[PDB]
Structure 1
Amino acid sequence: DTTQQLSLLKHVLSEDKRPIAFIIAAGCPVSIRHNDAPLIPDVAGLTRKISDSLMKIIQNLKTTIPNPTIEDILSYIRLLQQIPMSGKIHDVENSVINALEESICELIEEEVNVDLPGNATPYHKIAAWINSINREHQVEIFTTNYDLLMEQALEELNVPYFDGFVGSKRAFFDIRTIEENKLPSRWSKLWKLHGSINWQLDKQTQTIWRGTPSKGCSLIHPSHLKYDQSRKMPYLVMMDQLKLFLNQPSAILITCGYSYKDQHINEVLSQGLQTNPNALIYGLQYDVLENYQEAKDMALKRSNLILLAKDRAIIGKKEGEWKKLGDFQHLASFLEEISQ
């Protein structure tokens, strides 16, 4: 029954012991509505916003790819601009690919620059719950979004957090302090895998510094050359920190809004689940259970993964059935009730 699952989750998460971590996908801004409209729409919303904003590339990729997203388009544009004479596909005198890249990048940065509403935000409830627990095992948060909403709310709640960058308006990328891990217990870690809207590269070298949002320029979906390594690291070290948290004794993990559509994430989570049998994952789905074939396959393969959706509840690599927590506001309310 659902009630037994909820009670077990309450008495395993609310208990102070194993470390806690969350993953936040692009679906979280969908569940918050401002002026009867979502604050930030889904990925498809941004895609057809760009579309209504040169379809040739779109149908060129459509020949071998299904309905695309922005990340594929920008990766294709980057792959084009690696080649010097890349215009043979589209006319000559290369300017469109560049102009398209800037136009889309500042368009996205303008679309995402949104201010959080008042004190009713569920992020405030999550931050309050985080401040309500003083366990030695701190809570590290992984996000696939691009906005500043979560850390904005956390700062509005007066709580510390470390995101791998230290300094000022020209803060560099701290690298070693990531893996000495010599940080206060009260501090928490925030990792954004796909990047932020304020990171900017440098002409001298790959600095990926964090500070005041650079005019127009921004770094989204890191996929450039990685031969140099060390510099332009955050992507690899983000996955590395994810893998280290997946390993080690950690009998707790929560998911929220993840669509299980990332190959680089599905593979690493499967590897961690296979390597660590003691750890458990509580992946959810704010949709019908049938929309996630990859999640169903992962649940069938690895028993440690627990998949729950509106349609039914897959427990122990076996399909179940009912006889509420999908809503993210409902999730925040449940967290507040558990804390209180």
Structure 2
Amino acid sequence: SYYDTTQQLSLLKHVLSEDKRPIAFIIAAGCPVSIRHNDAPLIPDVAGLTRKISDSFSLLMKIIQNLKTTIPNPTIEDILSYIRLLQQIPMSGKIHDVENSVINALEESICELIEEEVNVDLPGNATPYHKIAAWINSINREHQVEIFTTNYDLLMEQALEELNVPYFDGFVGSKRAFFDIRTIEENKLPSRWSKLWKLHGSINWQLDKQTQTIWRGTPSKGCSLIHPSHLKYMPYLVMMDQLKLFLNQPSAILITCGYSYKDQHINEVLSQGLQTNPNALIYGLQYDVLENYQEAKDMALKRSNLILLAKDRAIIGKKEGEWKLFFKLGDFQHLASFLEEISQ
């Protein structure tokens, strides 16, 4: 009923010191929050973004109340999905009773505001991202380390470039950088080359004309494919398949930091992977009380090979217990320092 921090820390140190076993990562919105350039963090959290959209913009506020009838407090993703659905229907302006084209103007305004807010550079070489990048280059592992992100910024890319870290995000090309899909499944990539997948897109995505071919590059004004999933009839599907395929590797380990497990598709994929492969292990790291994560505790009770780490609570092997607050590893900077110490 009581757990020792030092035992888990030693277990993690032994795990990370291994070379052949595949490793991965998940970087959520809670990671950039732990890094601050001004008094506030360089990038706000999801709640901060929602509040900024709400107070920055009676007809406009109708949509927020309309979605709240069947769902809890709406977020950026829900609002963007509703705008996409509204644009799907041609004569959808009668619901808001505001013409039939103000939706496009609002979408352009919010996209421009999000791009302006997110297009920030991380200052200083002492950022945890640089520490992680250095740690990746320290040990020449037999299998490269993959990285999954659900953010919108390009902090990981810039950190990787700063320390000369080769990678491959599924895009090849200098000017247009068209999406190559056969080389992803062929998977005869360089051994030293790492991989980075942005599950929710970023500012460098732009959609072409009726050809609809996706490409990445310099962001353009009034265009940003920062849509989480949007809709289609796609890179998102192959990225999900890549994650699921990785989770089936023998003795695979996946580490989550700053992720609140609020999503449903990701949790379903993780549960399916854990059930399919009995040897996979996932380290759920939190920076709050475990009572806030109902889905995470439900999944930890359902699955046996899932480990959760919170400030004052932990669930290990279907047996919730208490620490001997504690577990200072929840913060992203502490994780980076641990990785740097392990590499050194």
Deviations 1:129-163 (A, max 9, x none): 00001111100100000100011011000010000
Residue correspondences, number: 334
Q: C-alpha offsets along residues 218-263 of structure 1, whole Å, 9 cap, x if unaligned?
A: 1012434422xxxxx1100110010011102034221111110111
Measured against aligned partners, the alpha-carbon deviations of 1:57-80 in whole angstroms (never above 9, x if no partner) come to: 001111111111111001001001
- Aligned position for 1:13: 16
| TM-score of the two chains, using structure 2 as the length reference | 0.95
- CA offset at residue 119 of structure 1? 0.7
**Structure 1 contact 145–195 (Cα < 8 Å) conserved:** yes
How far apart are the structure 2 equivalents of 1:205 and 1:266?
34
Question: Take 1:33 and 1:127, find their aligned partners in 2: how far apart are those partners?
Answer: 19
Query: Per-residue deviation at 1:14?
Result: 1.2
TM-score in terms of structure 1 length: 0.96
Secondary structure of the residue aligned to 1:306 is strand
Corresponding residue number in structure 1 for 2:29: 26
Question: Are the structure 2 counterparts of residues 302 and 116 from structure 1 closer, same or farther at C-alpha, using a change threshold of 3 Å?
Answer: same
Alpha-carbon distance, 1:120 to partner: 0.9
Structure 1: gaps of 5 or more residues: 228-232
Distance in structure 1 (CA, Å) of the matches to 2:238 and 2:252: 23
* 1:194 corresponds to: 200
Give the drift of 1:286: 1.3
Between the aligned residues of both structures, percent identity stands at: 100
- In 1, are the aligned partners of 2:282 and 2:306 still within 8 Å (CA)? yes
* C-alpha separation in 2, matches of 1:38 and 1:285: 18
Alignment check: 8 A CA contact 2:254 2:282 kept: yes
- 1:224 & 1:124 partners in 2: Cα distance? 32
Uncovered stretches (5+) of structure 2, i.e. residues with no partner: none
Q: Structure 2 CA distance, aligned partners of 1:327 and 1:4?
A: 19
1:333 deviates by 0.6
Q: Is the 8 A contact 2:246 2:252 kept in 1?
A: no
C-alpha displacement at 1:98, in angstroms? 0.8
Deviation at 1:92, TM superposition (A): 4.5
**What's the counterpart of residue 225 of structure 1?**
231
DSSP 3-state at the match of 1:116: coil
Task: Provide, for residues 73-100 of structure 1, a one-character-per-residue CA deviation record: whole Å limited to 9, x for no partner.
Answer: 0100100110011011112431221111
Secondary structure of 2:253's counterpart equals coil
Give the alignment's Cα RMSD to 1 decimal: 1.0
Q: 2:200 touches 2:229 (CA, 8 Å); kept in 1?
A: no
Structure 1 residue 20, shift from structure 2 partner: 0.8
1:205 Cα offset (Å): 2.1
Paired residues of 1:20 and 1:252 also in contact (CA < 8 A): yes
Q: Aligned partners of 2:321 and 2:340: how far apart in 1?
A: 28
In structure 1, what is the Cα distance between the partners aligned to 2:329 and 2:25?
15
Equivalent position SS for 2:82: helix
Distance (Å, rounded) in 1 between the aligned partners of 2:26 and 2:259:
7
**Paired residue for 1:204?**
210
Q: 2-side partners of 1:164 and 1:267: how far apart?
A: 24
